[PDB]
Amino acid sequence: DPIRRGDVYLADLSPVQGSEQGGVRPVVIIQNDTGNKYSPTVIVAAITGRINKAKIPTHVEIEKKKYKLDKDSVILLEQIRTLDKKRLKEKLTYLSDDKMKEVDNALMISLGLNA
Amino acid sequence: DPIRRGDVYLADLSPVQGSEQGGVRPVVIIQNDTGNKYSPTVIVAAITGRINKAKIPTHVEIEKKKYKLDKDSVILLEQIRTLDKKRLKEKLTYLSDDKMKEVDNALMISLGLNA
Amino acid sequence: QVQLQESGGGLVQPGGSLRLSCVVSGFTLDDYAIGWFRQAPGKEREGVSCISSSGDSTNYADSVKGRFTISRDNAKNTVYLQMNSLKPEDTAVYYCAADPFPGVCTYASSRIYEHDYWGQGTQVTVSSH
Amino acid sequence: QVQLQESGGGLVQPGGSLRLSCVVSGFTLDDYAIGWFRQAPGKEREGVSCISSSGDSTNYADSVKGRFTISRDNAKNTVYLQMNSLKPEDTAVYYCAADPFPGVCTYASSRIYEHDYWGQGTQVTVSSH
């Protein structure tokens, strides 16, 4: 019930046009915990089951061993959307402290928050 | 034609369920310029025409004087999505250097990238 | 429906204390964040402190922390602002304002953001007399 | 269709030079980023350098910058890697690999990410003989 940043969920991204996005599939919570409590929506980063390997610095690799997702996947930090909390179906796992820093660094690159 | 970070566009957020999001309305480009060139999609932050005043630190105020939007508005940095570039209709203006830093600071709060 | 009304204004000596109350009507106090805003003549309106719509988070202004204390009683639909160590520079017209936006006053900030629904003012003066 | 093939391997003395070529078939060279990856026995595969699908951005590894230079000729569908100041520790099997992902090798990074479509290897040795 409590939505925390770094948690791996399984929301319904559909219907989102055009390409890339689809139906019920895993995401990761990137919204801060203060907004995670009181906002009616949540910011999620996409988890792709397609060609799964870090292609760019805005990609972070996650494994089907430690995380309940199907096959080896990649966090898409260049593919983001904000969902109303009612779209989250069920939670899977949560990211490690070291894997969350990997997301925190790639997220500042795709948003150009460095320099 | 070149999409730059901080530019104010006018994309078609529809169809995005459930509430809050609607049809053709202004956004601001928050994706970094390296991804702005070669990615098929772009990350945008919502511009709301509703109750327009900074309510939380993830809000940034923008004016209808300097910017071609209708009435005084607010940048919603807690309401984000990634659009395929074909959804951008026409560009309006671009944010000032000082107003972009206001967005850059509020964006790190809603994503919990500080501490 | 109808909204807010402030009571408890008056005149104090420098260094005194005073408690402002804010009656709430026409909405549930647990749905709105309530803030306190003062406005001295010749100066722009200044935010003082706010309570969250839930009540777990409170923010104040730098010139206030350690002196004013905001409090809420949900059973009475009444919000309080205990003003202590009153300086003569705290003379202004204080307002309690409600805002139905989700997440207001939840973040830890030194700046309280302006609300939408306001009430009748109250006069708080402090000087030797 | 069919893909890539590397040529130009051989034996060099320490401090020598060599230019590796990479023929491309079955796709447009302007649609894929081409990278160079070497693999020494007993060691994990190491990325060396990549070219963008457009050709405006080039990245290298720290142990390489200032020595190897990646180049592209779109008219020939041929990618080059000019290897200079060759150390005996650069002995490995070099591969040129293509990847159809948008934005690959565009960011300025000291790490080249693994590609998807690979080609036949080439043997690059360097030691006194």
- Domains of chain D in start order, with CATH, are 4-111 (2.60.40.10)
The data reach a resolution, in angstroms, of: 2.9
Domain hosting residue B79, numbered range: 2-115
Give strand pairing partners of D95. Answer: D37
Task: Among A33, A58, A110, select the one facing B112 at the smallest CB separation.
Answer: A33
Tell how strand D78-83 and strand B8-12 pair up. unpaired
Full DSSP string of B45-80:
EEEE-SS-S--STTEEEE-TTTS-SSS-EEEEEEEE
Q: What is the CA radius of gyration of chain B?
A: 13
Q: Judge whether C50 is closer than 8 Å to chain B, CB to CB.
A: no
DSSP, res A94: B
Which tokens in the block code for residue A8? Answer: 């791996």
Side by side, the strands of the sheet bearing D68-73 are: D4-7, D18-24, D78-83, D68-73
Using the beta-carbon criterion (under 8 Å), do A55 and D107 form an inter-chain contact? no
Number of domains in chain A: 1
Residue type, B113: L
Are the beta carbons of B32 and A111 closer than 8 angstroms? yes
Helix (H) or strand (E) holding D93: strand D92-99
Q: Which of residues 76-115 of D touch A (CB under 8 A)?
A: 99, 101, 103-104, 106-107, 109, 113-114
- How far apart, in whole angstroms, are the C-alpha atoms of residue D41 and residue A113? 40
Q: To the nearest whole angstrom, how far is the Cα of C119 from the nearest Cα of chain B?
A: 18
- Characterise A112 by phi-psi region: left (phi > 0), alpha (psi -120 to 50), beta (else): left
Among residues C56, A84, A40, the alpha carbon closest in space to that of B81 is found at A84
Using the beta-carbon criterion (under 8 Å), do A32 and B5 form an inter-chain contact? no
Q: Name the residue with tokens 């209709």.
A: B89
Which tokens in the block code for residue B19? Answer: 């509430």
* Phi and psi torsions of C18, nearest 5°: -170, 150
Taking the mean position of all CA atoms in its chain, how far away is CA C116?
A: 14
∠ Cα C29 C113 B6 (to 5°) = 130
How many other CB atoms sit within 10 Å of the CB of residue D111?
Answer: 12
DSSP, res A106: H
- How far apart, in whole angstroms, are the C-alpha atoms of residue B44 and residue B87? 11
Q: Report the CATH number at residue A10.
A: 2.30.30.110
Using a threshold of 3 CB pairs under 8 A, tell whether chains C and D touch: no
Per the entry, the structure determination technique was X-ray
